[PDB]
């Protein structure tokens, strides 16, 4: 049971990091998790550019009909990848003790502290948190573009990331399919005469 429990992980996790693949790679001069863990040096690089215009109420992520999505709807001092408590804790971050609403609304009239070092003067956050008027909300962005087809960047960019908070559904490994609110993204293609069709 033990042998087949540790011999199935090496097969299910191949490639990527496994306890028996790192040791084999160690003969070739490879690290452990320091190789199979990608890090983002500048966390505000990318941020695909929308093509169209006529977007007044919110940024180009509010789309044409943002109903219920306000630039300043975010609860009290939420932080990155942690639960902010009232009393302190041993190894907290700097985000545990910061002003609730930073001044100088950046690009979207928002005064919300952004995580990961995303400068608010370039990142248009738009959430749904109302203390009094709980109306039903939905959002649709302005067809953010996507890079080229040469696949030389598609091999090195194996992700499209959206920084989000709230109670997202997602799907993890330690918990499985978690339920919540739909936040997914839909892609498109240029099938008809210069027109994107939403499918997928």
């Amino acid at each position: 049971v033990m042998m087949a429990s540790m011999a199935i992980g090496v097969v299910r996790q191949y490639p990527t990091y496994s306890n028996g693949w790192a040791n084999i790679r160690a003969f070739a001069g490879g690290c452990g998790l320091a190789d199979d863990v990608l890090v983002e040096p500048d966390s505000n690089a990318g941020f695909l550019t929308p093509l169209p215009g006529a977007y007044g109420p919110l940024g180009p992520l509010g789309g044409e009909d943002p109903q219920g999505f306000s630039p300043d709807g975010v609860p009290d001092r939420i932080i990155a990848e942690a639960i902010r408590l009232n009393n302190p804790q041993p190894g907290t971050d700097y985000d545990w003790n910061r002003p609730i609403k930073l001044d100088e609304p950046g690009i979207n009239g928002s005064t919300v502290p952004l995580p990961y070092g995303l400068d608010p003067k370039r990142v248009p956050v738009a959430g749904t948190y109302s203390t009094e008027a709980q109306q039903e909300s939905r959002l649709s962005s302005a067809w953010y573009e996507l890079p080229a087809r040469d696949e030389t960047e598609r091999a090195a960019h194996p992700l499209v990331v959206i920084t989000a908070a709230g109670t997202i559904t997602g799907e993890s490994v330690a918990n499985g399919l978690t339920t919540g609110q739909t936040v997914d993204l839909e892609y498109a293609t240029r099938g008809p005469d210069g027109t994107l069709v939403p499918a997928g």
Side-chain angles (χ1 to χ4, degrees):
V1 159
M2 269 175 274
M3 288 286 290
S5 178
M6 278 308 304
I8 283 177
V10 175
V11 162
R12 274 169 60 180
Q13 297 238 318
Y14 177 102
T16 202
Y17 176 85
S18 69
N19 216 339
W21 183 227
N23 298 341
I24 294 303
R25 288 187 288 114
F27 301 152
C31 301
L33 275 171
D35 265 356
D36 296 307
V37 168
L38 316 161
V39 75
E40 203 178 355
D42 204 10
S43 162
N44 42 42
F47 276 99
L48 313 159
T49 62
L51 70 160
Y55 302 121
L58 307 199
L61 79 162
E64 294 179 353
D65 188 295
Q67 41 190 37
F69 272 76
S70 44
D72 280 321
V74 169
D76 43 60
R77 52 172 63 257
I78 56 163
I79 55 188
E81 189 66 27
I83 288 182
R84 160 70 205 253
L85 272 297
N86 51 77
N87 53 317
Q89 297 285 75
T92 79
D93 316 328
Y94 178 49
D95 315 328
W96 268 64
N97 314 287
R98 269 183 58 201
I100 294 184
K101 292 297 182 190
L102 56 86
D103 53 328
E104 196 281 299
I107 193 152
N108 204 70
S110 68
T111 76
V112 191
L114 302 186
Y116 299 146
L118 301 151
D119 48 340
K121 53 203 221 183
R122 287 192 291 173
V123 171
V125 57
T128 74
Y129 187 77
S130 199
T131 61
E132 53 280 347
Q134 275 84 18
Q135 84 177 48
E136 300 310 314
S137 44
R138 60 184 48 87
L139 177 138
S140 48
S141 293
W143 285 127
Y144 287 95
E145 274 291 338
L146 216 57
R149 278 312 178 246
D150 56 38
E151 203 276 339
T152 42
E153 59 88 20
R154 198 179 83 190
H157 303 55
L159 274 183
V160 173
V161 189
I162 293 171
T163 314
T167 311
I168 302 297
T169 60
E171 40 180 333
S172 42
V173 166
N175 314 317
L177 320 181
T178 298
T179 182
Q181 285 71 241
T182 298
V183 68
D184 60 57
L185 51 82
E186 53 170 350
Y187 48 94
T189 175
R190 304 173 68 95
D193 186 305
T195 298
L196 297 172
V197 303

